[PDB]
UniProtKB/Swiss-Prot annotation, chains A, E:
Cited function: Controls reversibly actin polymerization and depolymerization in a pH-sensitive manner. Its F-actin depolymerization activity is regulated by association with CSPR3. It has the ability to bind G- and F-actin in a 1:1 ratio of cofilin to actin. It is the major component of intranuclear and cytoplasmic actin rods. Required for muscle maintenance. May play a role during the exchange of alpha-actin forms during the early postnatal remodeling of the sarcomere.
Organism: Homo sapiens
Gene: CFL2
CDD domains, alphabetized: ADF_cofilin_like
Tissues expressing the protein: Isoform CFL2b is expressed predominantly in skeletal muscle and heart. Isoform CFL2a is expressed in various tissues.
Record's disease association: Nemaline myopathy 7: A form of nemaline myopathy. Nemaline myopathies are muscular disorders characterized by muscle weakness of varying severity and onset, and abnormal thread-like or rod-shaped structures in muscle fibers on histologic examination. Nemaline myopathy type 7 presents at birth with hypotonia and generalized weakness. Major motor milestones are delayed, but independent ambulation is achieved.
Domain ADF-H as annotated: residue spans: 4-153
PTM sites of type N-acetylalanine: A2
High-level lineage: Eukaryota, Metazoa, Chordata, Craniata, Vertebrata
Protein name as it appears in the record: Cofilin-2
UniProtKB/Swiss-Prot annotation, chains B, C, D:
UniProt modified residues of type ADP-ribosylarginine: R177
Molecular function terms from GO: actin monomer binding; ATP binding; calcium ion binding; calcium-dependent protein binding; cytoskeletal motor activator activity; hydrolase activity; identical protein binding; magnesium ion binding
Encoding gene per record: ACTA1
Region (Interaction with alpha-actinin), start-end ranges: 110-123, 358-370
Origin species: Oryctolagus cuniculus
PTM annotation: Oxidation of Met-44 and Met-47 by MICALs (MICAL1, MICAL2 or MICAL3) to form methionine sulfoxide promotes actin filament depolymerization. MICAL1 and MICAL2 produce the (R)-S-oxide form. The (R)-S-oxide form is reverted by MSRB1 and MSRB2, which promotes actin repolymerization.
KW Hydrolase (keyword) present: yes
Protein name: Actin, alpha skeletal muscle
């Protein structure tokens, strides 16, 4: 047997809940998920959802100094993951929101994890209709600060990202 | 939470779709009004995960990619890819469901009755909105510039338009077209960079040249003085890094580029300039109303954004039209978006709704409702 | 499926064959792809049961034969001696039957269609294999290093390749080979030890000189600084201990050996070095992609193993690459077999039988089947 | 005779520089546009004389030279090696003194008109000429082919030029460069020979790759139709004799090499081939003259010399353009010296004073007089 | 020295007699040339007229189909020339009798006839006046019948050329 793992459809439920707005009356303020992560299930057959430290809405003011910070300080240190990020950013002429698809690979991780997630780069992405920006993240030095995440998103077009000014 | 929600506003301009919500004080999406489809992948790139691309995305993702503007010469001739631009606006750039939101569309000047009616069809048939309207760009820029009677010059990317307006109503017959626009000034920028010995031929080089144009071009007030000061400069020339880190340099080309919009003669085009087409639009109007058209020249559009252009317009109009009328230009600092800003602020007011087309009036009386709303 | 046969992975490489079972992440058969054909006729009483001795059996002779690779130039330039190499792989070195197990076979980059077709032919017709699969060495190395976009340097035994990759697709307009490799570093090592007056002439001493390369060489961090130091102190040299001989002590030649990769002038070539050819490969890739290749130069192949080489690569590439580009090289701990290990890993995934070329698809589609079944 | 001053004639386009006298049907100096300036230090330096290696000298003194091509993509920017290659043409090849001789020079396509002043400047204020004149090589080639109106092409070994002309005047907005010709064709030649395991990698072996390119290659009448004819041909494969007496075979490479001028797809360019370049040029011209451009497409030039190229140019434009258009692709049986011999035959009638800039007219006016004299 | 060539007004004396109308009942019939050729000298400093056959409007009775379909059977396939034709086309909307200038330069004609006749082509085109149309023609197959001549005058008015319906 000689190809990569399948995408389980419960990532598409998560993606099409994450990526959209809602009515701002309550549902935007009560249903949004700003970072979300997926894992290889150790059945070795599929990508699923995992015990992963997402943040919602209030959690950014009530505790964690930005939302993107909550994800990229809490990445699994020795295994690869697939993730989505809902990037909300300020350019030199407009506000913008764009949907980031993230392959996380810590460079010290197992070679067979890397192969499974690399050979499913094609398979998972055709389900993620309207993905704008793809990150291949190779180590925590490919994250760095939050300005480097603006460079990895859209270069010098961005001037503020997630409420952190670049 | 229906009609009490924030309205969606999309300016459907000739080479930049500018969109957001009514009460966003700057747009929430900006992208090229261009669609394409790849050719020849497998031979120099992997086979496309999106067998169709829109916007900046269509310039970015590689292959022998064939692009189209569906609004090719300022009127919407193709709908097949224009309905993809609206699909792309809502579900990919603004990331909302259009079925949630009352929608203000704009139209470019001269938009046919059947195009207005097909634009009413699309929002209820292809996108299922609760209510909408289609407003002419020039009136929103004029009303935000504080006039109800005046003349708007719009210079877009795919068309330039000269639009006399009397208490919100534009006079169609006296509107003058200019087919040279922002995309075509970028073609002359590519030419004068080839005279300086650069390769600039690909879509990837051309959209760096299109960035260079909007970042670095200006209009000269007196070109011979500017070219004499170029031959004695210490500041005109500007170096620029390409995104692979290769350095290029552009100087005099920064004012040779947009000069062709005022003086088509500069490229051998036997056509009149933006000041002359504005003058020819005013001079076709009745004697008793021309006075305050000279005092109320609005600059709208994306290609009116260059430094010195309004000051050159002041010079070029006073070198052409008599000085017994008081000449005035009004040219806002964000002018490319001023149309959409006027849209955003107008579309925040629920205080009278007779002008808004409901789904009810569509299911009663079809897209022909769009003509009764202009009153 | 997973309760069935442990699939074989054969890396044909660049002159050294590696083979073993899939999911054992180190090779277990490993022999030189050298075929020793006789230089004269053999006696018919006491005659041998093969025409030519291969690999282990080619080197375990003396004088009677001429040694040749079938894959000499980085493509299969004799097929009968390569058909012999696979016969010697199964029945002399890997020590299994071919028609027992699924086989994954590596391909070299820049091969013509017919190479993939004839390699599929061989395994089904000459060896009766049930299930076959084919993969590019660089993709196996890149995916084992956790990249989908990047540039793999594969510095082999008989050829060095630079392969730039984007979304798993290798960009064919920008792949570069160089004929200089591990063979010639060992041949040059033998000649620079002849300047030191050592005997090194025989095919036995040629494998001891292979060992003097493996056990003692490094790349100098700056050649002239290292040469100035190594000409003024022996606190840099070391013995190779022969068991029958003595302490063969290698000085400057420890680093003048692999300096050939950065300076082909030492081999007598006017050609570009590894860093020049990597840069020339990157700068021939499409303008966007250049950013992503600079940040993802992966090392693979046997001749990338020397200490100081990744350190030297980052130094000598920042004398070529713009100072605004963010350069990141990736040398895996051992990187010698990264190609084959990526194959072993890929041929033991718990997912998809449907990528194996089965003999029942060859029945319909013939030798062309391989071009439907690859990524 | 010894009176009626016969002028010097020189052509410079995109490859071979061609020089001789007026009325003479042969050049007396022909060599490539190449100047080798060192990577740092040269080879055989002592007392300096003319230490940039030019033409014949540059390829024969390989490796250490950063080879520059003074006239290449059309617009000269590398102007100091242009100084030295003109000096080489006059005083090293022809071995005459420009101090005696009225010099006719060509303008290569796309040059900005200040580049005419720079050659007027250099010919007086460096070479001390009595008189100069300049005309466009493309127009001279079109006139020598028997047309005043038409669309001429020259594919050399720098780029391919394509120039639409009405009554001797090239139509500015519709002149086109394609950055693919003989040099990059001859690179692809070595890659498609690499598929069969041949490697020829020195500058001395790169002489063989041109020798193959010039002698044995032709354009396929259709690619896979030629492949089907090759698969049944008794004469497609040619056993080739190397300078040192060795033998190889050049085969299916003979057509798949020239195929690149229609297929820039094999070079990784989004820019289309010669056929679409000629069509997109005619598509940027006025209605009432496109008739004469389709009916007079003239194949001139160096690498355009191949059989099948005009024949194939018919096929791919009749598939691209609406089939009610009439298109004649004309190609003379020699076409390579058309540019220069058109200048010689234009010059051939003696005694003239109008369109020549003489020294005594420069003394009171500078180089800008060229625009009053050279069309 | 790039001297060029000059037209002597002997070419213009025959042009004037050819161009202008006279008495209709005889002198339009046999004092108008309908075809003439003009030729470079052996000296090559001038354009001349020679014995290269002129034919009139009435000679359709004495010999030919029409004068210009006789002239194309007499054109030199291996030399470049100028010609002149008074082209008659007829319909109910207009009876157009246009004088046409012709540059003849065959594919088979030599490069050093070509370049000389091509560089002096538009000196003679400014000496003639009351020409309506011009042809650049490059072989017999570009000129072989009236119907191929009518295309290069164009419009839709050429329902007949030289007494032959198209």
């Amino acid at each position: 047997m000689a190809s990569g793992v399948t995408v389980n459809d419960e990532v598409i439920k998560v993606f099409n809940d994450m990526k959209v707005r809602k009515s701002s009356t309550q549902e935007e303020i009560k249903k949004r998920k700003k970072a979300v992560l997926f894992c290889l299930s150790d059945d070795k057959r599929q990508i699923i959802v995992e015990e992963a430290k997402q943040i919602l809405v209030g959690d950014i003011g009530d505790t964690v100094e930005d939302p993107y910070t909550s994800f990229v300080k809490l990445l699994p240190l020795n295994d690869c993951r697939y993730a989505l990020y809902d990037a909300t950013y300020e350019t030199k002429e407009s506000k913008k929101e764009d949907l980031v698809f993230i392959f996380w690979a810590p460079e010290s991780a197992p070679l067979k994890s890397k192969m499974i997630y690399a050979s499913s780069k094609d398979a998972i992405k055709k389900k993620f209709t309207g993905i704008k920006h793809e990150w291949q993240v190779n180590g925590l030095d490919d994250i760095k600060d939050r300005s480097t995440l603006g460079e990895k998103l859209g270069g010098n077009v961005v001037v503020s990202l997630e409420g952190k000014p670049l | 939470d229906e009609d009490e929600t924030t309205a969606l506003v999309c300016d459907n301009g000739s080479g930049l779709v500018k969109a957001g919500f009514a009460g966003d004080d700057a747009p929430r999406a900006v992208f090229p009004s261009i669609v394409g489809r790849p050719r020849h992948q497998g031979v120099m790139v992997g086979m496309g995960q999106k067998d169709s691309y829109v916007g900046d995305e269509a310039q970015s993702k590689r292959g022998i990619l064939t692009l189209k503007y569906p609004i090719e010469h300022g009127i919407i001739t193709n709908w097949d890819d224009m309905e993809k631009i609206w699909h792309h606006t809502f579900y990919n750039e603004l990331r909302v469901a259009p079925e949630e939101h009352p929608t203000l569309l704009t139209e470019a000047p001269l938009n046919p009755k059947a195009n207005r009616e097909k634009m009413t069809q699309i929002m209820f048939e292809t996108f299922n909105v609760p209510a909408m309207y289609v407003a002419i760009q020039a009136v929103l820029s004029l009303y935000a510039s504080g006039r109800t009677t005046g003349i708007v010059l719009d210079s877009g990317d795919g068309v330039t338009h000269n639009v006399p307006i009397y208490e919100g109503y534009a006079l169609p017959h006296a509107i003058m077209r200019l087919d040279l626009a922002g995309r075509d000034l970028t073609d002359y920028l590519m030419k004068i960079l080839t005279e300086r010995g650069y390769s600039f031929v690909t879509t990837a080089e051309r959209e760096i040249v299109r960035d260079i144009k909007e970042k670095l071009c200006y209009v000269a007030l007196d070109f011979e003085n500017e070219m004499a000061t170029a031959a004695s400069s210490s500041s005109l020339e500007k170096s620029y890094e390409l995104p692979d880190g290769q350095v290029i340099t552009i100087g005099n080309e920064r004012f040779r580029c947009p000069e062709t919009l005022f003086q088509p003669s500069f490229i051998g085009m036997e056509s009149a300039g933006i000041h002359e087409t504005t003058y020819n639009s005013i001079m076709k109007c009745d004697i008793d109303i021309r006075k305050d058209l000279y005092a109320n020249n609005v600059m709208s559009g994306g290609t009116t954004m260059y430094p010195g252009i309004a000051d050159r317009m002041q010079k070029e109009i006073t070198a052409l039209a008599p000085s017994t009328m008081k000449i005035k230009i009004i040219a806002p600092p964000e002018r490319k978006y001023s149309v959409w800003i006027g849209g955003s602020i107008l579309a925040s007011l629920s205080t009278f709704q007779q002008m808004w087309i409901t789904k009810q009036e569509y299911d009663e009386a079809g897209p022909s409702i769009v003509h009764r709303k202009c009153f």
